[PDB]
Amino acid sequence: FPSRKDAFRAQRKGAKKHRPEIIVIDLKDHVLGRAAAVVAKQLLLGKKITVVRCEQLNIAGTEIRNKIKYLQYLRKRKLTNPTKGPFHHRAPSDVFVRTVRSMLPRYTKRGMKALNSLVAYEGIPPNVVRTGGRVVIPRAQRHVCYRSERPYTVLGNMCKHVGWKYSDVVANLEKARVEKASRHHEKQAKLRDAWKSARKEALAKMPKHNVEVLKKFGYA
Amino acid sequence: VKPHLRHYQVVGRESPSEKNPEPTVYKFEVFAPNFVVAKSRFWRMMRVKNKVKATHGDVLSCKVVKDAKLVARNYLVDIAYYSQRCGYTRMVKEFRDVSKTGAVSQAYHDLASRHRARYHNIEVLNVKSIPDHEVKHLSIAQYHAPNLSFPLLQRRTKATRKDRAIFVKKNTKRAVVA
RNA sequence: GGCCAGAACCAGCCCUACUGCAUUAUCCUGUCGGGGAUCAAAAUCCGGCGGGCAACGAAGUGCAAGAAUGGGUCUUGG
RNA sequence: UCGAACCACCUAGUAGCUGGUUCACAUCGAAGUUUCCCUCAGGAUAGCUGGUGCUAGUAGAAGUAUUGUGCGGUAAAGCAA
RNA sequence: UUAGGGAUAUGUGGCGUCAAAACUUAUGGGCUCAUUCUCGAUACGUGAAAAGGGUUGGUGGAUCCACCGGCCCCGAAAAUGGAUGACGCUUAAGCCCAAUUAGUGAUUGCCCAUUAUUCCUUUGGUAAGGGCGGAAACAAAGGAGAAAGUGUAGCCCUUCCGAUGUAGAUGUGGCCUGGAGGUUAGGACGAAGCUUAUGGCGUGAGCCUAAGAUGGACCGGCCUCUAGUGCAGAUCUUGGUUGGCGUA
RNA sequence: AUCGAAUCGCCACCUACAAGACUGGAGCUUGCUCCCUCGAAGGCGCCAAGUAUAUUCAUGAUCACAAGACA
RNA sequence: CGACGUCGCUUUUUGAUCCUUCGAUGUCGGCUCUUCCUAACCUAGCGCCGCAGAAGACGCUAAGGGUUGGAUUGUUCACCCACUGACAGGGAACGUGAGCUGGGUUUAGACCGUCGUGAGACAGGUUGGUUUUACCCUACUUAGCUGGAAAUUGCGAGAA
Ligand SMILES: [K+]
Ligand SMILES: [K+]
Ligand SMILES: [K+]
Ligand SMILES: [Mg+2]
Ligand SMILES: [Mg+2]
Ligand SMILES: [Mg+2]
Ligand SMILES: [Mg+2]
Ligand SMILES: [Mg+2]
Ligand SMILES: [Mg+2]
Ligand SMILES: [Mg+2]
Ligand SMILES: [Mg+2]
Ligand SMILES: [Mg+2]
Ligand SMILES: [Mg+2]
Ligand SMILES: [Mg+2]
Ligand SMILES: [Mg+2]
Ligand SMILES: [Mg+2]
Ligand SMILES: [Mg+2]
Ligand SMILES: [Mg+2]
Ligand SMILES: [Mg+2]
Ligand SMILES: [Mg+2]
Ligand SMILES: [Mg+2]
Ligand SMILES: [Mg+2]
Ligand SMILES: [Mg+2]
Ligand SMILES: [Mg+2]
Ligand SMILES: [Mg+2]
Ligand SMILES: [Mg+2]
Ligand SMILES: [Mg+2]
Ligand SMILES: [Mg+2]
Ligand SMILES: [Mg+2]
Ligand SMILES: [Mg+2]
Ligand SMILES: [Mg+2]
Ligand SMILES: [Mg+2]
Ligand SMILES: [Mg+2]
Ligand SMILES: [Mg+2]
Ligand SMILES: [Mg+2]
Ligand SMILES: [Mg+2]
Ligand SMILES: [Mg+2]
Ligand SMILES: [Mg+2]
Ligand SMILES: [Mg+2]
Ligand SMILES: [Mg+2]
C-alpha cells in the first residue's frame, strides 16, 4: 500500500499510471531445473520476471521417488532449536523460488536484489490475466526434453501429498478462469473476422505497384 | 560426419647387412588417425611377428588407400581385442555404411561402447563388403527390404543458430528475449 | 593553455582475407559370364576382356615460400 | 618462616636448560650427514655457504653420448646338472 | 617456479546456474532407471569382497541349450541434521569413444596464471662499446649542459643479460640520536619543544615546506672524530589510565 | 513544493484452451491418393491520416546524456 | 542346525603406536536429566515350520511408545528374592564434579604379613584423612521498548 506522502507527490507531479517492463512466463509442462537455471541467469542480467502456473511443473522420475526425496529434505532440522533451523516450504511456488534461490549468490546485495526481482504464483491471478501475452522457454519444455516412454511427475500432486493444503482451491479458481476466458474469446470472433475481411479487401483498393511489392516480399 | 580413421598401406623391410643381403619386403594394412601412428603400428607388428626392430629397418612406402564411391553396403569386420580378465577375444560383426573406413570407425566406437576397449588394445583382422543374401543378423538384414519406409517420430528440431531465442510467445513465433 | 575530447597522416608492431606443387589403381567406366531378388526387373556381390583424369571449388593427403601493394594500436612513439 | 629459623655479606654464585634481543635497501645463500668424545636436549672434526683474492683468459673441463677395451652374479631360469 | 606494469597466446583444469567459457555446440556413434546413509559423475584419496539376477553384446553345440563380457541390482547394520562442493540433471548437466561449425571443398571452437613472446620503467653485472684538444658564428629590447669518472641529484649516450628465499655472510658519497675539532649560516619582524583531511620529495629508513586563532630563548647544513646511539611483546621495570560498573 | 535526475514499443485483432506416437477434410489400399483457405508469419508502429512532383526547418557553425519524450 | 575351509563388517573389549596436550583439558562409580542408533525384549502388521488346538522356533517392514522394586558388594560386572506385556543392547570427551556425593584409587599418622643388615619396599590386607570462584560472551528459559521492502537511501513505480 502506497503512503500518503507518495500519493501527494504523484498528484503534485501530475503523472500518468506507470508499469515497469515485466516478462510473464507460463511454466506449464516445463522442466524444473532447466527453467530455474534460465530464469536465474536472466535475473542476474537484470530482468523483471513473473511466473505463473507453478503447480504444473514437471520432474523426471516417479512420484514416489520424488516424494521420498522431499521427505529426506524435510528430515533436516537443527536439533538444538528447530525455530532457527531450515524452513521447509510446501507450496509449489515456494519450491520454485527456493530452487531459483539456490542458483544465485544469495549472501550478497546483488543476489538479494536479483531474488527480489522475482514474483511467483499458482494459477493465473486476475492482476496478471490481462497484462499481455505470456512466454515459454523452448529449451526447457517437456515434449523436447523427456523421452516419452519414461514416467514423470507433476509438482502439484507431490506437494499435496507432502503437506500443501490449497490444491482444490487452485483447481476451482483455474476452472473458473478458463470458463470466463473461453466465453470472452467466443465473443469478439465477429470482430476478428471483420478485421480479416477488411485486410483481404484492402488489396483491391490499394495501388498496384504497392501490391506488387507486397507480393515480391511475400506479405500478399 | 567423416570417419576419424584413415586407411593406410605401409611397405617396409629390414636393412640389408652381410648376414641378409636381400631381405624380404612386407606389406601391411592399418586404420590409424595419421601416418605416424600407422608407422608405429607397422613396426609393432614387425617386432612381434618377424623379430625385426625399427632401429634396424627401412620404410619403403606409406600411402593412403582411397575410398570407393559412396553406396549403401553391408560390411563384415573381423576384429579382436584384449582384456585382463579374458585374454584375447575375437569376434565377427556386420555393419551398414558407405565406406570401409566408415565401417571400421563404427566398429571401434561400438567396441568402446559395449566392451570398454580402447584403440591400442584392438587389432583389426579383416574387413570386406558382402552381398545381401550372405547377411546373418536380422538387425542388419531388415534394411535391404524392397519396400522399406518409416516415419520420423519424437524429433527434436533446433532452430538455426542465428535465429535461436530464449523467451518466445506462447502460440507465436515472436521472440521476446533474444 | 602544461586541461578534455574527435578525426587525418607517418614509423613500428599485431590479427585478418586472397594459394600453388606433388600423389591417386584395393579406384572410374563399358562389355561377357554367374549370382541374387522380383511380379518381371534392376541393385548389393564374384570372374575375364577393352578403355581411363571420379578433376563440379575432385580428394579430409604430403609439403606450401601466396603483401608489386583489410582492419586495430586509451597495448608504442610522432 | 622449620626433613635445618631469621639478618647482612662472599653473590651480578654456576646453568650443555626456558624467555628476550631496537633502522632501511642491495648482492649471494644452507644443514639435520661422516669420525671422535661418561658422547645421545652438547661439542670438536669434514661436507654444504659467504667474503677476500692469486695466476699466462679458453689451459689439467663435463652428474651426457659414440667407438674400443676390462669388471659383475641381482631379475629371470634349473632341479631331466 | 616468482624486479614494477600493459598487450597477445598457452599449461593443469574446465564451458546448466552459483562462476569467465558450447546465451544447454554438431547437420557424431552406442549403453544405463537406481522407493528413506535417497544410481553416477571420488587421479593421489578419502568405500566394498566371496557369492548371485533386468537389459545389451560375443563364442560353441541342437533342431533351443551350455559358456563370459558391458551397464544396472542384491549381498551392504550406528549413534547431533547434512552433503558428486550446493541446487539440480535422465532427447543428461551420467558412462565409453570421437570432433570443431561438419561426406562442402583440406590444418587454430572458447575461458582462466606472478609461465611463454613482445613493449615501457627500475636495479645489479666476470658486463660490451662510443664521446670528453670546447668545430665556426651568434648583445639585450632556438635554450641549457658537457666532471678522464668504484660508490651521488649517478660525467653523457647506446647495447645485452640476471632479479623470489628461513638460518647465515657481505656492501651502501645508505637513514636517524647525544657530545668534540673545523667551516658556513639562522633567531624577539620569534630558537627548541608540541599539534595536523599541510602538501612536496625518496623503492625505503626518512627529509623539507605550510598553518598554529601554540610557545617564549636558543639553534640548522656540510667534512672529520666519538659513544651509556634506534623497541611491540622478555608471567619485562616505574608512573598514569581503563572495560567489567553505578555492577558484587 | 524541494525535483535537476538513470529507464526510450503499444494495442479494446497477442493478452482463451489442449496435443508433439498425429495438426485443414475425406478415402481405403494403412501409407498412399484426392479436395481445400495448400498446412514454417498476432496486428500496428519507423515523419503528407497516405504514395501523390504538397510543405517552416540553418548561425545549436564536424562527436559529446536525447538541447526531446502523455505515440 | 551345520564340521573341514573361505570372504567380510563394527569400534560398545583388550592389545600395538606415540600425532595433540606436562607456564595443568579435574580422574572410578552412583544420583539427576535430555537426546541419538538398531544388530527388535514387549507393543503393530505380515511369511514359514518338523505349525491339529494351546504353548513356541525362524524370518521381513518397523526405533512411534515402553523396558520395574529389593538382599550382599565402592563397584562396572555377577548372583539371588519377587512383580510384569517385557524386565533388549549401545553412543553422546569410557555424556554429565564452577550439578551433587567422596565409598574406592593415590600424600603426610598408625598396625600386620612377606622382603631387606639398614634407611625402607609391596598393581598385599587394615583404620583416619580441606571437593575453591560466575556479576563477562554465547546457548537456553521467561520478561519489556522499537524501527524497517533499494530491508534505514532513489524521486528505482510490480495489488492472489
Ligand atoms: K526446522
Ligand atoms: K550382369
Ligand atoms: K583401540
Ligand atoms: Mg567388369
Ligand atoms: Mg611458626
Ligand atoms: Mg648476568
Ligand atoms: Mg642469581
Ligand atoms: Mg645437553
Ligand atoms: Mg627464543
Ligand atoms: Mg639466488
Ligand atoms: Mg672417556
Ligand atoms: Mg629445546
Ligand atoms: Mg628367482
Ligand atoms: Mg637355467
Ligand atoms: Mg637338485
Ligand atoms: Mg549455490
Ligand atoms: Mg557465464
Ligand atoms: Mg548379463
Ligand atoms: Mg546429493
Ligand atoms: Mg553418490
Ligand atoms: Mg565440483
Ligand atoms: Mg634490465
Ligand atoms: Mg633477493
Ligand atoms: Mg651521552
Ligand atoms: Mg587525524
Ligand atoms: Mg643501551
Ligand atoms: Mg616505548
Ligand atoms: Mg538529457
Ligand atoms: Mg600434561
Ligand atoms: Mg593449556
Ligand atoms: Mg573444562
Ligand atoms: Mg583449568
Ligand atoms: Mg567409546
Ligand atoms: Mg567440584
Ligand atoms: Mg562440568
Ligand atoms: Mg574416601
Ligand atoms: Mg628381618
Ligand atoms: Mg580409607
Ligand atoms: Mg525505503
Ligand atoms: Mg518509492
Which nucleotide in the DNA or RNA is closest to residue A64, CA to C1'? E35
The whole-angstrom separation of Cα A38 and Cα A57 is 15
Cell of B152: 520420423
Distance A158 CA to G64 C1' (A): 24
Query: Phi/psi of residue A32, each to 5°?
Result: -60, -55
Burial of B37 (0-12, 13-18, 19+ CB in 10 A): middle
CA A36 to CA A134: how far, in whole Å?
17
Residues of B within 8 A of A131 (CB-CB) are none
20-49 on B, CB < 7 Å from strand F:
none
If you search the block for the grid coordinates 515459454, which residue do you land on? A136
Query: Nearest nucleotide, C1' to the C-alpha of A74?
Result: E81
Q: Name the method of structure determination.
A: cryo-EM
Query: What is the grid cell recorded at B134?
Result: 550372405
Cell representation of residue A98: 527456493
Contact state of B166 with A134 under an 8 Å Cβ cutoff:
no
Q: How far apart are CA A29 and CA A111, in angstroms?
A: 28
CA distance B55 to B83: 30
3-state secondary structure of A31: strand
Cβ < 7 Å from strand F, A residues 201-220: 206-207, 209-210, 217-219
Asked if B166 contacts B172 with a C-beta cutoff of 8 angstroms, the reply is no
C-alpha distances (whole Å) from A130 to each of A177, A203, B30 are 12, 33, 69
B154 contacts A135? CB cut-off 8 A = no
CB of B175 less than 8 A from some CB of A: no
- Residue A108 grid cell: 550478497
The reply to whether A34 touches chain B by the CB within 8 Å rule is: no
CA distance linking residue A35 with residue A96, whole number of Å: 9
For residues B64 and B6, the answer to whether their CB atoms sit within 8 Å is yes
For cell 570386406, what's the residue?
Answer: B128
Q: How far is CA A120 from CA A54, A66, A94, A106, A156, in A?
A: 7, 22, 8, 18, 15
A38: chain B residues, CB-CB within 8 Å = 166
Angle at B123 (CA atoms; ends B63, B93), nearest 5 degrees: 105
Query: Which residue bears the cell 544469495?
Result: A106
A134 in reach of chain B (CB within 8 A): yes
Nearest CB to B156: which of A23, A26, A144?
A: A144
Distance A63 CA to ligand 25 centre (A): 67
Residue numbers of B between 32 and 61 with CB closer than 8 Å to A: none
- Residue A125, CB, less than 7 Å from strand G? yes
Q: Ligand 36: distance of its center to the CA of B140 in Å?
A: 94
Q: Strands, E, within B84-166: which ranges?
A: 87-97, 122-130
Which uninterrupted H or E stretch holds A178? helix A167-186
Q: What residues form DSSP beta bridges with B28? A: B10
Answer positive or negative: Cα dihedral of A47, A137, A133, A123: negative
**Beta-carbon neighbour count of residue B9 at 10 Å?**
15
* DSSP at A84: G
**Phi/psi at A51 (5° precision):** -110, 140
Whether A132 contacts chain B with CB within 8 A: no
Chain A residues with CB inside 8 Å of B167's CB? 23, 25, 135-137
Centroid of ligand 12 to alpha carbon of B38 (angstroms)? 66
Angle ∠(B137,B139,B141) on CA atoms, nearest 5: 65
Nearest of B79, B77, B71 to residue B97 by alpha carbon: B71
Select from A70, A185, A163 the least CA-distant residue to B171: A185
CA A71 to chain centre: 26
Nucleotide nearest residue A16, measured CA to C1': F70
> How many Cβ atoms sit within 10 Å of the Cβ of residue A142?
15
Residue B167 Cα to ligand 27 midpoint, Å, equals 70
Q: Which of chain A's residues have a Cβ under 8 Å away from the Cβ of B165?
A: 138
CB-CB contact of A119 with A23 (8 Å): no
| Entry resolution (Å) | 2.4
CA of B89 to C1' of E185 (A): 106
Question: Ligand 4: distance of its center to the CA of B73 in Å?
Answer: 19
Is B169's CB within 8 Å of A137's CB?
no
Contacts of A47 in chain B (CB under 8 A): 177
Say whether A134 and B170 touch across the interface (CB within 8 A).
yes
